[PDB]
Amino acid sequence: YESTTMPNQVGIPFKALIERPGYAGLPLSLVVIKSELVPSLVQDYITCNYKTVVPSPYIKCCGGAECSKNEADYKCSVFTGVYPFMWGGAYCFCDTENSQMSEVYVTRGESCEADAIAYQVTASLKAQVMISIGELNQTVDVFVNGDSPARIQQSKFILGPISSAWSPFDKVIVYRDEVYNEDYAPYGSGQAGRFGDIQSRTVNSTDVYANTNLKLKRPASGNVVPYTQTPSGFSYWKKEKGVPLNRNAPFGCIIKVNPVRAENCVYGNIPISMDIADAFTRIDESPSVSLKACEVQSCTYSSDFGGVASISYTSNKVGKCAISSNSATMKDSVQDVQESGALSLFFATSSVEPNFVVQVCNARITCGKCEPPKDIVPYAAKNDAEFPSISTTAWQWLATTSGPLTILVVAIIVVVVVSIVVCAR
Amino acid sequence: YESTTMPNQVGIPFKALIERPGYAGLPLSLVVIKSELVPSLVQDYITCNYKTVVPSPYIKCCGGAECSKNEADYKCSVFTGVYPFMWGGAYCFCDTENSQMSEVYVTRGESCEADAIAYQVTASLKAQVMISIGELNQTVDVFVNGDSPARIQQSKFILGPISSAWSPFDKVIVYRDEVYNEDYAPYGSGQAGRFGDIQSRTVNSTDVYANTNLKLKRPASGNVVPYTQTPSGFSYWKKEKGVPLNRNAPFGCIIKVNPVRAENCVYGNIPISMDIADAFTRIDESPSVSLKACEVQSCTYSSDFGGVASISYTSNKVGKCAISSNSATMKDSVQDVQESGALSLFFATSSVEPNFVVQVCNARITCGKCEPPKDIVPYAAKNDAEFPSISTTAWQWLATTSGPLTILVVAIIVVVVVSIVVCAR
Structure with a gap:
C-alpha cells in the first residue's frame, strides 16, 4: 500500500516501489536538492542611527525660564547671569542678569532601513524535493509541516516531516550589510553598555527613546559658547557588527543574506508514503538472470565522491525491472534489462554503507572489494573486519585466546581424580 | 537606596520609601491599576468564509472532454447520459454522445466581519502602575520586562526585570465573537476537517489552501447540477464554534478580543526600584513620639470590611513625616504630624492582610490583637501563639511533654546507682 523511509541526505537518488510487491517499469525516484529553513518571525524592536541636533543658544531677556519645549528625547539646562562682557550678542538691556535657555x-534618522532589526525566529520548514516518475521530471518547492498531499498524474505522494536537530535562526541581529548571529536581551536598547542606545518600537514611529551625552557650559568671555559633544551610541555599535550568520549551525546550513534562509540542511529522516499506480499489467516483464558478476575498478582513495562499480550479467529475456532499490543505488531507475547486459553504473551510497547487494531483478550478489589494505599483505572482507579483516593471518594471531581454555579442561580433571580417592574412604 | 519585591495585587496600596541613610521623605505610594499583556505574536494564517463560484456548465456535443483550466481549488466532472435526446436545452447535433463538462x-471574497485570525502568541507583560511621590498623582505605561530607567518628576525610577512571566494564550484563534483556545497544525490541509483548513496569507490574491469535498455526479436526465458540498474544515466548524479562553484564566486576566490585551493579571511579582532625590529639607525635622499603643475596634470572623482603629501616642514639635513601614494599611503617606493623644484613623486591615504595621515618624509597632476562638477556647490571640493560644486547653496539651521527663530523670537514678554497687567490688 505505502510507506518507505529515506534519510535526508541531499543529491543522492532514492528509489521507492510500493503499492504491492512485484516489479514496475516506471517507479518513483526522488532526490532532495535542498532543505530550506525559512523564517516566521516577531520583530522585537528596531534600532538605528539617530540625528541628535543641538541648537545653538536662544536667549531670553532679563531672566528666562527652563525648557517647556518637548520632542522625542530632550535634555535642557538653564544658565543664568550669562554674557558677562558680551560681544553685542546679548541683544538685551541685561548683561548682569540675562539667561540662556x-x-x-533627538530626531530619528533615515538609517532605519534594516540597520538593524532584532528578530525572534521560529522557522517554518520548506523542502525542494525533485520528483521523477520517469516521464515528468520536475522539482517542486513544498512545505513539509505534517501531512502534505501532492498529486502528479493522480497518484498520491505525501511529503512527511523532517526531524530538525536545530535551526540557525534564533535571536539574531540583522544589519543590512550582512545577517549576523548575535543575541540580545529584550528591552536592552536605550541604555549604554548593552546593545543599542536607542529604542524605537516600529519603523514608522518618529519618536524614539535615545540616550546621548552632551556637555553645555556658560560663556565667560568676550567671544561667543563653550560646549563639548561626543559621537552617538548607535554609531559606536555600527562598527562593531556581530559575527557572520553564514557558517553557524553544524550539519550543513549555509545562510545567505539576500534570500534570508539556510540552504542544504541535512538533519533526520523523512518518512514518505505514496499510493502510485504500477499495476498496469503485472508482470510488467521480469527477465530471469544468469552469470551474475561484480567487477570493481577505478579504486582510488577518497570517499567524498560516489561509487563506481560495474555489474556484469547475461539475461534470457528483455524486460523492465525497477532496480535498484536501497540495498544499492543505480543511475537508472527506469531501466531496460537486456541479454548480455554489462553496465557501468553510478552509486552514491557506498560510503554510508560500503556493503552493497546489487540486484538485477530477482538475482543478486554482494560487493565491494576495495577497502584500505593494511597487514601489510592485502586483505579485504566485508561485513566485519578484524583489522586486518578476516584472513588466515588474523585467525592465526587470534589463536592465542584459545590456549588457556584448552589446558583448563585438562586441569580440572587432574584436580578431580585426586579428590575422588579422598572422599571414597 | 532601593529595592523591593512587591506582589502584583490590584488595588493594594504598596509603600516603599527605602532611600539612602538619613531620613528620606516624599514616599512612593503605588497602586497597580492594571497590568496589560501586550502581545508578541506571529501570524500563522488568516482565515474567513468563502464565496463558491460556478461559471455555468459548458456542454459538448458529439463526445465530451475534461477540464483544462485548473485552480488551487478545483473540481471537474464530465457528466454522461446527459440529454438522451434533444430535450429542449440539449444544444447539440448528437444525443448518443451528449456529454457535459x-x-x-471556490474563491475567497474575504466574506467575514473579523472572523477569524490564527496566531502563535507568547505575550509580553507591560504594567500600568499608578505612582504617587507624595507630590503628584500620575499614571504611565511602562515595561516590567528588562531594565527600564526613566526619570519622571525629577525622581528616578527603574521598573526592573520580571520575577516570572506567563500568558494563558497558546495557539489561539481569535474570533470576533469571543476568543477561543484551539489547536491546529499549519499547512496540514488534505482533509475535510481541521480547524483553520482554509489558510490564506496573501490578502491581495484569491488563493487559499484548503481541502473541500463537492459531489457532482452524472445525472441521466435532461434536467441538469446535483451540487451538494460538505465544505472546508474552517466553514464546517464555524457553526460549531470553539470554547472560550475568556471563561477560565488562572491568576486574573480578563481577555479582550478586539484590542488584544489581557487586563488585570496578578501573575508574578514585580521587582521595583526608586532613587528619590526631591528635597524639601532632609532630615525632615520630624516630631519625636512616644507611647505607641493600639486600640482595635470591631473584631469578629474573617471579613473584607474596613479598619476603624485609633492610636494613642504623645507628640512634641510639628513636622512632616514619611510614613509607613514596608507593609501598612493607612491611606495616608503625606501627613503633617502635630502634638496629639488618641487619634482615630481609617484603614484597610482585613482587606490587605489581618496584620498591619503602623508607623508615625521614627517609631512604629505591629498590631492588632484579635482572633476569635473556634475550638472553642477561652482566649485566642496572635501572632506567635500556638493557635489555640495560651489557654487551659493549651496547658492540658503542653503537659504531654512533662510525662517523659519526670520518669527519665528518676530512671537514670535507678540504673546508675545499681551499677555503682556492682562496680565497687
Missing part, C-alpha cells in the same frame, strides 16, 4: 533634542 | 471552484 540651552537646548538639545 | 462541469467545473466549479
Whole structure:
C-alpha cells in the first residue's frame, strides 16, 4: 500500500516501489536538492542611527525660564547671569542678569532601513524535493509541516516531516550589510553598555527613546559658547557588527543574506508514503538472470565522491525491472534489462554503507572489494573486519585466546581424580 | 537606596520609601491599576468564509472532454447520459454522445466581519502602575520586562526585570465573537476537517489552501447540477464554534478580543526600584513620639470590611513625616504630624492582610490583637501563639511533654546507682 523511509541526505537518488510487491517499469525516484529553513518571525524592536541636533543658544531677556519645549528625547539646562562682557550678542538691556535657555533634542534618522532589526525566529520548514516518475521530471518547492498531499498524474505522494536537530535562526541581529548571529536581551536598547542606545518600537514611529551625552557650559568671555559633544551610541555599535550568520549551525546550513534562509540542511529522516499506480499489467516483464558478476575498478582513495562499480550479467529475456532499490543505488531507475547486459553504473551510497547487494531483478550478489589494505599483505572482507579483516593471518594471531581454555579442561580433571580417592574412604 | 519585591495585587496600596541613610521623605505610594499583556505574536494564517463560484456548465456535443483550466481549488466532472435526446436545452447535433463538462471552484471574497485570525502568541507583560511621590498623582505605561530607567518628576525610577512571566494564550484563534483556545497544525490541509483548513496569507490574491469535498455526479436526465458540498474544515466548524479562553484564566486576566490585551493579571511579582532625590529639607525635622499603643475596634470572623482603629501616642514639635513601614494599611503617606493623644484613623486591615504595621515618624509597632476562638477556647490571640493560644486547653496539651521527663530523670537514678554497687567490688 505505502510507506518507505529515506534519510535526508541531499543529491543522492532514492528509489521507492510500493503499492504491492512485484516489479514496475516506471517507479518513483526522488532526490532532495535542498532543505530550506525559512523564517516566521516577531520583530522585537528596531534600532538605528539617530540625528541628535543641538541648537545653538536662544536667549531670553532679563531672566528666562527652563525648557517647556518637548520632542522625542530632550535634555535642557538653564544658565543664568550669562554674557558677562558680551560681544553685542546679548541683544538685551541685561548683561548682569540675562539667561540662556540651552537646548538639545533627538530626531530619528533615515538609517532605519534594516540597520538593524532584532528578530525572534521560529522557522517554518520548506523542502525542494525533485520528483521523477520517469516521464515528468520536475522539482517542486513544498512545505513539509505534517501531512502534505501532492498529486502528479493522480497518484498520491505525501511529503512527511523532517526531524530538525536545530535551526540557525534564533535571536539574531540583522544589519543590512550582512545577517549576523548575535543575541540580545529584550528591552536592552536605550541604555549604554548593552546593545543599542536607542529604542524605537516600529519603523514608522518618529519618536524614539535615545540616550546621548552632551556637555553645555556658560560663556565667560568676550567671544561667543563653550560646549563639548561626543559621537552617538548607535554609531559606536555600527562598527562593531556581530559575527557572520553564514557558517553557524553544524550539519550543513549555509545562510545567505539576500534570500534570508539556510540552504542544504541535512538533519533526520523523512518518512514518505505514496499510493502510485504500477499495476498496469503485472508482470510488467521480469527477465530471469544468469552469470551474475561484480567487477570493481577505478579504486582510488577518497570517499567524498560516489561509487563506481560495474555489474556484469547475461539475461534470457528483455524486460523492465525497477532496480535498484536501497540495498544499492543505480543511475537508472527506469531501466531496460537486456541479454548480455554489462553496465557501468553510478552509486552514491557506498560510503554510508560500503556493503552493497546489487540486484538485477530477482538475482543478486554482494560487493565491494576495495577497502584500505593494511597487514601489510592485502586483505579485504566485508561485513566485519578484524583489522586486518578476516584472513588466515588474523585467525592465526587470534589463536592465542584459545590456549588457556584448552589446558583448563585438562586441569580440572587432574584436580578431580585426586579428590575422588579422598572422599571414597 | 532601593529595592523591593512587591506582589502584583490590584488595588493594594504598596509603600516603599527605602532611600539612602538619613531620613528620606516624599514616599512612593503605588497602586497597580492594571497590568496589560501586550502581545508578541506571529501570524500563522488568516482565515474567513468563502464565496463558491460556478461559471455555468459548458456542454459538448458529439463526445465530451475534461477540464483544462485548473485552480488551487478545483473540481471537474464530465457528466454522461446527459440529454438522451434533444430535450429542449440539449444544444447539440448528437444525443448518443451528449456529454457535459462541469467545473466549479471556490474563491475567497474575504466574506467575514473579523472572523477569524490564527496566531502563535507568547505575550509580553507591560504594567500600568499608578505612582504617587507624595507630590503628584500620575499614571504611565511602562515595561516590567528588562531594565527600564526613566526619570519622571525629577525622581528616578527603574521598573526592573520580571520575577516570572506567563500568558494563558497558546495557539489561539481569535474570533470576533469571543476568543477561543484551539489547536491546529499549519499547512496540514488534505482533509475535510481541521480547524483553520482554509489558510490564506496573501490578502491581495484569491488563493487559499484548503481541502473541500463537492459531489457532482452524472445525472441521466435532461434536467441538469446535483451540487451538494460538505465544505472546508474552517466553514464546517464555524457553526460549531470553539470554547472560550475568556471563561477560565488562572491568576486574573480578563481577555479582550478586539484590542488584544489581557487586563488585570496578578501573575508574578514585580521587582521595583526608586532613587528619590526631591528635597524639601532632609532630615525632615520630624516630631519625636512616644507611647505607641493600639486600640482595635470591631473584631469578629474573617471579613473584607474596613479598619476603624485609633492610636494613642504623645507628640512634641510639628513636622512632616514619611510614613509607613514596608507593609501598612493607612491611606495616608503625606501627613503633617502635630502634638496629639488618641487619634482615630481609617484603614484597610482585613482587606490587605489581618496584620498591619503602623508607623508615625521614627517609631512604629505591629498590631492588632484579635482572633476569635473556634475550638472553642477561652482566649485566642496572635501572632506567635500556638493557635489555640495560651489557654487551659493549651496547658492540658503542653503537659504531654512533662510525662517523659519526670520518669527519665528518676530512671537514670535507678540504673546508675545499681551499677555503682556492682562496680565497687
